[PDB]
Design a protein around this motif. Structure first.
Motif, PDB file in Angstrom:
ATOM      1  N   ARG A 513      13.345 -26.089  29.259  1.00 51.14           N
ATOM      2  CA  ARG A 513      14.248 -27.117  29.754  1.00 51.14           C
ATOM      3  C   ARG A 513      15.689 -26.633  29.807  1.00 51.14           C
ATOM      4  O   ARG A 513      16.515 -27.268  30.466  1.00 51.14           O
ATOM      5  CB  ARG A 513      14.124 -28.368  28.876  1.00 51.14           C
ATOM      6  N   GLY A 534      17.323 -23.480  22.518  1.00 48.59           N
ATOM      7  CA  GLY A 534      17.595 -24.841  22.927  1.00 48.59           C
ATOM      8  C   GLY A 534      16.353 -25.569  23.379  1.00 48.59           C
ATOM      9  O   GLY A 534      15.328 -24.942  23.651  1.00 48.59           O
ATOM     10  N   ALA A 535      16.431 -26.895  23.449  1.00 51.24           N
ATOM     11  CA  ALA A 535      15.300 -27.719  23.860  1.00 51.24           C
ATOM     12  C   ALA A 535      14.066 -27.403  23.025  1.00 51.24           C
ATOM     13  O   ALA A 535      12.937 -27.439  23.516  1.00 51.24           O
ATOM     14  CB  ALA A 535      15.009 -27.547  25.348  1.00 51.24           C
TER      15      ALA A 535
ATOM     16  N   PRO B  20      21.742 -28.076  26.715  1.00 56.14           N
ATOM     17  CA  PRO B  20      20.806 -29.009  26.073  1.00 56.14           C
ATOM     18  C   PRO B  20      20.906 -28.937  24.560  1.00 56.14           C
ATOM     19  O   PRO B  20      21.136 -27.859  23.995  1.00 56.14           O
ATOM     20  CB  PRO B  20      19.436 -28.521  26.559  1.00 56.14           C
ATOM     21  N   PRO B  21      20.721 -30.052  23.862  1.00 58.62           N
ATOM     22  CA  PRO B  21      20.677 -29.994  22.398  1.00 58.62           C
ATOM     23  C   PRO B  21      19.473 -29.205  21.905  1.00 58.62           C
ATOM     24  O   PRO B  21      18.403 -29.223  22.513  1.00 58.62           O
ATOM     25  CB  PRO B  21      20.603 -31.466  21.991  1.00 58.62           C
ATOM     26  N   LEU B  22      19.658 -28.510  20.784  1.00 57.40           N
ATOM     27  CA  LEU B  22      18.597 -27.661  20.257  1.00 57.40           C
ATOM     28  C   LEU B  22      17.368 -28.473  19.870  1.00 57.40           C
ATOM     29  O   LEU B  22      16.236 -28.051  20.122  1.00 57.40           O
ATOM     30  CB  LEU B  22      19.111 -26.861  19.060  1.00 57.40           C
ATOM     31  N   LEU B  23      17.564 -29.628  19.241  1.00 54.10           N
ATOM     32  CA  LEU B  23      16.461 -30.495  18.852  1.00 54.10           C
ATOM     33  C   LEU B  23      16.210 -31.504  19.963  1.00 54.10           C
ATOM     34  O   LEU B  23      17.114 -32.254  20.340  1.00 54.10           O
ATOM     35  CB  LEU B  23      16.768 -31.222  17.542  1.00 54.10           C
ATOM     36  N   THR B  24      14.987 -31.532  20.477  1.00 49.88           N
ATOM     37  CA  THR B  24      14.643 -32.493  21.510  1.00 49.88           C
ATOM     38  C   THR B  24      14.573 -33.900  20.930  1.00 49.88           C
ATOM     39  O   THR B  24      14.508 -34.102  19.716  1.00 49.88           O
ATOM     40  CB  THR B  24      13.305 -32.140  22.158  1.00 49.88           C
ATOM     41  N   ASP B  25      14.591 -34.887  21.823  1.00 46.87           N
ATOM     42  CA  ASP B  25      14.434 -36.266  21.382  1.00 46.87           C
ATOM     43  C   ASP B  25      13.099 -36.477  20.688  1.00 46.87           C
ATOM     44  O   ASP B  25      13.002 -37.302  19.775  1.00 46.87           O
ATOM     45  CB  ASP B  25      14.572 -37.213  22.570  1.00 46.87           C
ATOM     46  N   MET B  27      11.499 -34.174  18.804  1.00 44.76           N
ATOM     47  CA  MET B  27      11.647 -33.646  17.452  1.00 44.76           C
ATOM     48  C   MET B  27      12.466 -34.574  16.568  1.00 44.76           C
ATOM     49  O   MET B  27      12.148 -34.746  15.386  1.00 44.76           O
ATOM     50  CB  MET B  27      12.293 -32.264  17.490  1.00 44.76           C
TER      51      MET B  27
ATOM     52  N   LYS C   6      27.273 -31.165  24.564  1.00 42.18           N
ATOM     53  CA  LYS C   6      27.685 -29.776  24.440  1.00 42.18           C
ATOM     54  C   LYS C   6      28.038 -29.252  25.821  1.00 42.18           C
ATOM     55  O   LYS C   6      27.224 -29.332  26.742  1.00 42.18           O
ATOM     56  CB  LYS C   6      26.576 -28.920  23.826  1.00 42.18           C
ATOM     57  N   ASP C  48      24.883 -29.192  17.160  1.00 38.18           N
ATOM     58  CA  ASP C  48      23.541 -28.953  16.635  1.00 38.18           C
ATOM     59  C   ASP C  48      23.510 -29.096  15.115  1.00 38.18           C
ATOM     60  O   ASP C  48      22.555 -29.652  14.556  1.00 38.18           O
ATOM     61  CB  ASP C  48      23.037 -27.583  17.079  1.00 38.18           C
TER      62      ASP C  48
END
Ligand SMILES: *[C@@H]1O[C@H](CO)[C@@H](O)[C@H](O)[C@H]1NC(C)=O
Ligand SMILES: *[C@@H]1O[C@H](CO)[C@@H](O)[C@H](O)[C@H]1NC(C)=O
Ligand SMILES: *[C@@H]1O[C@H](CO)[C@@H](O)[C@H](O)[C@H]1NC(C)=O
Ligand SMILES: *[C@@H]1O[C@H](CO)[C@@H](O)[C@H](O)[C@H]1NC(C)=O
Ligand SMILES: *[C@@H]1O[C@H](CO)[C@@H](O)[C@H](O)[C@H]1NC(C)=O
Ligand SMILES: *[C@@H]1O[C@H](CO)[C@@H](O)[C@H](O)[C@H]1NC(C)=O
Ligand SMILES: *[C@@H]1O[C@H](CO)[C@@H](O)[C@H](O)[C@H]1NC(C)=O
Ligand SMILES: *[C@@H]1O[C@H](CO)[C@@H](O)[C@H](O)[C@H]1NC(C)=O
Ligand SMILES: *[C@@H]1O[C@H](CO)[C@@H](O)[C@H](O)[C@H]1NC(C)=O
Ligand SMILES: *[C@@H]1O[C@H](CO)[C@@H](O)[C@H](O)[C@H]1NC(C)=O
Lengths: 985, 29, 48
Positions: A513, A534-535, B20-25, B27, C6, C48
């Motif tokens: 993603r 990421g993702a 994108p944020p490292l942790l998905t929604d 997770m 970000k 993060d």
């Protein structure tokens, strides 16, 4: 025959001495690992954009070159020839032989001559701005694989065009390309290594960080892959040509006295149609086309050749003064040409009756001398009134290129981009289209009227995942926001070098993603994140290869919930954990005048006109510096009394040697405190400097570090006083007078706090003491051999040092001035222009200082939040026992111990962790004699047959009497009430 | 559904990208 | 609120945008985007 160039061909880019530095240079370099044509022993090779030429030999057979375009006698050529004792360099219209080795036949019209004076000889030949630059190097040696920089040899002002060259006789030829190289200078003075930024992703990362070593992680790079672009002009299909055909082919022209005046306007005037039939004043013939006018006034007439000179600005002859008076200053193009075969009537052409006084007649014959002969004249007067120009030249147009980064000019709108047709539907009158940024994104082609969607070329930089250059040179590349079918088109992976195209395909391709990741193998196993992509995707170095995987959250653990089962811990652990908090940061001072105007007095007197900027900067930095001491004071100067521990250090078997002050050292630091002190490396520390490395550079530029008010020894004394107070008086010294209490009794108080009775500590005193001692020893051991436990404090130090170094390096910026040296500006320019340049420099450096100060203020607010949290921890974890979950360590907080670390504090949190749980049956209440009983302080548990009441955090079953339960109501409400006996004593 | 989470392409064509944020929604859930 | 968006910036694209003339004039600053990009990268890591 081709061979590998490796890393040969680096040369010194300029004449400046540099030492122990990394310098980026964008020039013409032979790319690393290039293909070199190897010739053994002499063909004519192209020159392109410069050449690298190596010769391994022992006999001196290769001793010259010729350079040129045609190498014939119709063009100037360059000849370099070494001889027994001299080098002769000539530039002439040589007629070179078929096979030169006697090298030429003719030498007419020379322009320049200059005579001067197993081995490997390397040369670099460049032809820039009229100068032929030659660099060279000679060594005593496939081509070697060492690094050897070529030194400048000579710059020759030859001023010719060179496209091909030949050697005059193994020898290897490579071609320079426009590249950025990162060069490393030694200390004893030399270029000893270089990085080719366009070679591959790792080199791009190295050139983005300006370093030769990269740590493990993911880095966003800047685009060092430079692609060429061609130009395309598109103007409207011309049409509407000016009626100039009627002024240059009319049968009979007027007579100079009765001269005509046409008003050519609103049309395209192709003046180039002349030259096939031209003195232009106030204008040049070559610019006539790209100029415009309101109305070109075309006068036409006929005169005799002798009078043509009179038609011009400033002449005062008879025609110029009695027939056609042309102003001394004007713009136009007098176009005269002999038209004798069009205006010489036999017996006399009395059709051109010219004025002389009243007016006589020219009367030409077809036999007159050249002299007085019919000469047609068209005076093309021009106009530049403020009214709109409507007469213009043809405005030629190029063809249209599509799907290529190009410089385009559509009907006067210029820009670089890639044109890819479009689906947009403009209104018929709309010519361009704009996007949200208010920047052109579509253009209608003026001729074909189709709509082309402009898109950027070079989507920019990529992300490079490296395990660290120390470990390996393997990398992965993430292309953000792209799918792995467009990657090769996106990066233009056909004009890229090899070793870059390997990162565009290859079946090691995984989609995320975040974008496309090439160079890593996606495993289905899940581990902890090592390098975050990421993702949910992370990367790591397997060992051997780079693996990508989905991040693992942790171990799954179902809990056996039941309506009547309770797990109660039967044992416990005394855990000691660390918590590192920054408290203060480096106090910095800037000499504003020294930084901005170093050693220049004119700059200082100019700086006196920019207001209070330097005063405001000094005030802000002084506020930060005072706040640092306030932070330290609020954290460590809580107790006012300096408590001391008793000379005898017996505390019920609890051993505090590792945290208590040690007299066997001048600082009286504790062993753990000493270890922490030696684990964080300070940069400056703000102490006396005696006149006579990077600190010296900063100091010379006016940037200093001020010492903290409290010394490390005083902070250690505050820490030792806190430790003594808590060891000898518990939490009392925080609320009033310090009340002594034996340490086992205090520990029993703290066990009561977390809800376990005092007996549990008095009956397990030795075990608890040994667990605590072992935990403290483990704290010391995992500090003496931990990679980066103090990474937060070191991060504070490094951030401050890096900001100061950035400030020092920003002094090399010119900010659009001629130089970054104020003295040179003042010594080369007069005040009128020196003011512009110095204003640029002063504004740039003021902005750089203001940016530094703003970042310092933001970081100081962050450090002040951290220091406030540290003060709260000191109050509530060291000066008391906290009930807040996870404030003072993981587990039920028992106590905490502070230790001073160079720029912060370390808390040793001692917590109680239940362990060795056991399942039991439980009931809400017990029915007895028709009365419901609930546990006073406990829970009802069952060993299977018998029922006891136990404390919740430690299994200590008791007989269920009437002195450990309380009665409330009957057994007809409580959902789960069990039947048993209460032993009324 | 309650928080409203070509413009992004238009910006990305000007150097600005939203990582994108490292942790998905999933997770975080 | 726990985290913000970000963002990442490429100076050469934002300031110059495919223009080589501007790109070569922007190297006389050099450390200003190293600093700006480093600030934004710090922010993203903090999210993060
Ligand atoms: C050199 O040429 C070979 C084929 O002749 C090619 O495979 C290789 O990629 C080339 N190397 C470079 C750096 O252009
Ligand atoms: C500089 O010269 C000295 C003197 O010969 C030599 O020992 C030294 O190795 C050179 N520099 C370095 C960094 O080694
Ligand atoms: C110019 O000629 C071309 C050739 O057919 C045509 O496509 C174009 O529309 C013409 N220009 C105008 C403004 O009509
Ligand atoms: C990329 O294009 C492929 C080819 O159709 C498609 O399957 C994939 O969904 C696309 N991915 C993105 C992120 O647009
Ligand atoms: C009590 O737990 C058992 C097993 O989980 C379950 O079958 C039963 O439904 C629970 N009690 C009630 C009232 O549901
Ligand atoms: C509790 O754990 C310790 C080890 O830390 C052990 O020595 C002790 O026997 C344990 N207590 C019980 C009741 O098992
Ligand atoms: C306390 O521990 C330290 C370090 O483990 C040790 O050197 C010292 O002898 C111990 N003191 C006592 C009284 O056991
Ligand atoms: C309690 O019982 C469950 C299921 O029988 C088991 O999974 C769990 O480990 C037990 N707990 C303890 C502390 O033994
Ligand atoms: C009852 O509990 C006690 C714990 O004090 C235990 O020693 C005993 O074995 C238990 N009885 C049975 C029958 O499990
Ligand atoms: C406790 O004993 C009474 C006595 O009659 C009985 O009615 C009741 O059901 C018993 N309670 C339980 C939970 O079995």
């Amino acid at each position: 025959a081709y061979t590998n160039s490796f890393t040969r061909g680096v040369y010194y880019p300029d004449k400046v001495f540099r030492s122990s530095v990394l310098h980026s240079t964008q020039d013409l370099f032979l790319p690393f690992f290039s293909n070199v044509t190897w010739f053994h022993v002499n063909p004519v090779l192209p020159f392109n954009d410069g050449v690298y030429f190596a010769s391994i030999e022992k006999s001196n057979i290769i001793r010259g070159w010729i350079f040129g375009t045609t190498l014939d006698s119709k063009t100037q050529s360059l000849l370099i020839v070494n001889n027994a004792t001299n080098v002769v360099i000539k530039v002439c219209e040589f007629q070179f032989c078929n096979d030169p080795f006697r090298v030429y036949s003719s030498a007419n019209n020379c322009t320049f001559e200059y005579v001067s004076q197993k081995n490997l000889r390397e040369f670099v030949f460049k032809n820039i701005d009229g100068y032929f630059k030659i660099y060279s190097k000679h060594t005593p040696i496939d081509l070697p694989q060492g690094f050897s920089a070529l030194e400048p040899l000579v710059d020759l002002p030859i001023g010719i065009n060179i496209t091909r060259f030949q050697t005059l006789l193994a020898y290897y030829v490579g071609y320079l390309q426009p590249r950025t190289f990162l060069l490393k200078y030694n200390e004893n003075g030399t270029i000893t290594d270089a990085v080719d930024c366009a070679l591959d992703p790792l080199s791009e990362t190295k050139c983005t960080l300006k370093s030769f070593t990269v740590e493990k992680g993911i880095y966003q790079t800047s685009n060092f892959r430079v692609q060429p672009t061609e130009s395309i002009v598109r103007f409207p299909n011309i049409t509407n040509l000016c009626p100039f055909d009627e002024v240059f082919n009319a049968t009979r022209f007027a007579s100079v006295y009765a001269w005509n005046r046409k008003r050519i306007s609103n049309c395209v005037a192709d003046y180039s149609v002349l030259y096939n039939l031209f003195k232009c004043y106030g204008v040049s013939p070559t610019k006539l086309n790209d100029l415009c006018f309101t109305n070109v006034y075309a006068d036409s007439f006929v005169i005799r050749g002798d009078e043509v000179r009179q038609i011009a600005p400033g002449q005062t002859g008879n025609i110029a003064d009695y027939n056609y008076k042309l102003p001394d200053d004007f713009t136009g193009c007098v176009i005269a040409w002999n038209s004798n075969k069009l205006d010489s009537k036999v017996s006399g052409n009395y059709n051109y009756l010219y004025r002389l006084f009243p007016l006589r007649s020219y009367s030409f014959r077809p036999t007159y001398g050249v002299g007085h002969q019919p000469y047609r004249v068209v005076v093309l007067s021009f106009e530049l009134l403020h009214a709109p120009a409507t007469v213009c030249g043809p405005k030629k147009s190029t063809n249209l290129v599509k799907n290529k980064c190009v410089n385009f000019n559509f009907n006067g709108l210029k820009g670089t981009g890639v044109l890819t047709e479009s689906n947009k539907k403009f209104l018929p009158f709309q010519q361009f289209g704009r996007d949200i940024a208010d920047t052109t994104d579509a253009v209608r082609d003026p001729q074909t009227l189709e709509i082309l969607d402009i898109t950027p070329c070079s989507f920019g930089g990529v992300s490079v995942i490296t395990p660290g250059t120390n470990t390996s040179n393997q990398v992965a590349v993430l292309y953000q926001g792209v799918n792995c079918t467009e990657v090769p088109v996106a990066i233009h992976a056909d004009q890229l070098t090899p070793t870059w195209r390997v990162y565009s395909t290859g079946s090691n391709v995984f989609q995320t993603r975040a974008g496309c990741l090439i160079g890593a193998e996606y495993v289905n196993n899940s581990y902890e994140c090592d390098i975050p992509i990421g993702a949910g995707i992370c990367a790591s170095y397997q060992t051997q290869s780079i693996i990508a995987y989905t991040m693992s959250l942790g171990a799954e653990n179902s809990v056996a919930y039941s309506n009547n089962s309770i797990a109660i811990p039967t044992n416990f652990t005394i855990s000691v954990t660390t918590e590192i908090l920054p408290v203060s940061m480096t106090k910095t001072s800037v000499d504003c005048t020294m930084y901005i105007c170093g050693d220049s007095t004119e700059c200082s007197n100019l700086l006196l006109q920019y207001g209070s900027f330097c005063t405001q900067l000094k005030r802000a930095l002084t506020g930060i510096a005072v706040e640092q001491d306030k932070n330290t004071q609020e954290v460590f100067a809580q107790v006012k009394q300096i408590y001391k521990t008793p000379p005898i250090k017996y505390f019920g078997g609890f051993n505090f040697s590792q945290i208590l002050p040690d007299p066997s050292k001048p600082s009286k630091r504790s062993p753990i405190e000493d270890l922490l002190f030696n684990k964080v490396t300070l940069a400056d520390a703000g102490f006396i400097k005696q006149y006579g490395d990077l600190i010296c550079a900063q100091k010379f530029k006016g940037l200093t570090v001020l010492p903290p008010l409290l010394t490390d020894e005083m902070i250690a004394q505050y820490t030792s006083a806190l430790l003594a107070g808590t060891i000898t008086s518990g939490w009392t010294f925080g609320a009033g007078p310090a009340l002594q209490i034996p340490f086992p009794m205090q520990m029993a108080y703290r066990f009561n706090g977390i809800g376990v009775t005092q007996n549990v500590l008095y009956e397990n005193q030795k075990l608890i003491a040994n667990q605590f001692n072992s935990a403290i020893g483990k704290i010391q051991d995992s500090l003496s051999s931990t990679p980066s436990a103090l990474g937060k404090l070191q991060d504070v130090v490094n951030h401050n040092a890096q900001a100061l170094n950035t400030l020092v390096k920003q002094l090399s910026s010119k900010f659009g001035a001629i130089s970054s040296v104020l003295n040179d500006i003042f010594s080369r320019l007069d005040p009128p222009e020196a003011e512009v340049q110095i204003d640029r420099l002063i504004t740039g450096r003021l902005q750089s200082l203001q940016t530094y100060v703003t970042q310092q203020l933001i970081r100081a607010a962050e450090i002040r939040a951290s220091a406030n949290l540290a003060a709260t921890k000191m109050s509530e974890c060291v000066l008391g026992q906290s009930k807040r979950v996870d404030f003072c360590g993981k587990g039920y907080h028992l106590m905490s111990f502070p230790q001073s670390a160079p720029h912060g504090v370390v808390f040793l949190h001692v917590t109680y962790v239940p362990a060795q749980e056991k399942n039991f049956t439980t009931a809400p209440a017990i029915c007895h004699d028709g009365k419901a009983h609930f546990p006073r302080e406990g829970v009802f548990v069952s060993n299977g047959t018998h029922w006891f009441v136990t404390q919740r955090n430690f299994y200590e079953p008791q007989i269920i009497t009437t002195d450990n339960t309380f009665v409330s109501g009957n057994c007809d409400v409580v959902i789960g009430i069990v039947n048993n006996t209460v032993y009324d004593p």
